[PDB]
Design an enzyme around this catalytic site. Structure first.
Site: not given
Length: 162
Positions: A11, A20, A32, A104, A117, A132
């Site tokens: 990040e 972003d 965010l 996150f 998955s 996957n």
């Protein structure tokens, strides 16, 4: 290596409001602020989150505070989610970090929708899960980060972050 350092790598850190990868106003370590196109709405969210009139700029300590809250929120959200909790509880600590990283980035509801998955991860079919996971908008839009997270699920090591 740990989940905080892993997410700092993925990040970065920016102390002024920035957009972003999806064009949404964000600050700090991937915090965010809002999906609204209004920068004023974003600045209002920021002041509410920090507790002062920031004027769109925060300190490193303030960014780290939001980050600690956000990591905590990701973990708590996993534990409260009926689809994510069994998978998380089945994983070792390194792969747990990979799941936290996904939550996150895209949110608890988004990750909980990766039904196939998640099942492969629960089954410990690591190479299959990795294949996957890559068949996703997530991988196509942020491939370098997704590759790191997927390698972490595949290997159960931190190799992709060293």
């Amino acid at each position: 290596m740990n989940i905080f350092e892993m997410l700092r790598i993925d990040e970065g850190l920016r102390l002024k409001i920035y957009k972003d990868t999806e064009g949404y106003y964000t600050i700090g370590i991937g915090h965010l602020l809002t999906k609204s196109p209004s920068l004023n709405a974003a600045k209002s969210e920021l002041d509410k989150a920090i507790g002062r009139n920031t004027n769109g700029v925060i300190t490193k300590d303030e960014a780290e505070k939001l980050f600690n809250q956000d990591v905590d929120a990701a973990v708590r959200g996993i534990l409260r989610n009926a689809k994510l909790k069994p998978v998380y509880d089945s994983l070792d600590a390194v792969r747990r970090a990979a799941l936290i990283n996904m939550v996150f980035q895209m949110g608890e509801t988004g990750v909980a929708g990766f039904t196939n998955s998640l099942r492969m991860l629960q089954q410990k079919r690591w190479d299959e899960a990795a294949v996957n996971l890559a068949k996703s908008r997530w991988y196509n839009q942020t491939p370098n980060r997704a590759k790191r997270v997927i390698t972490t699920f595949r290997t159960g090591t931190w190799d992709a972050y060293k």
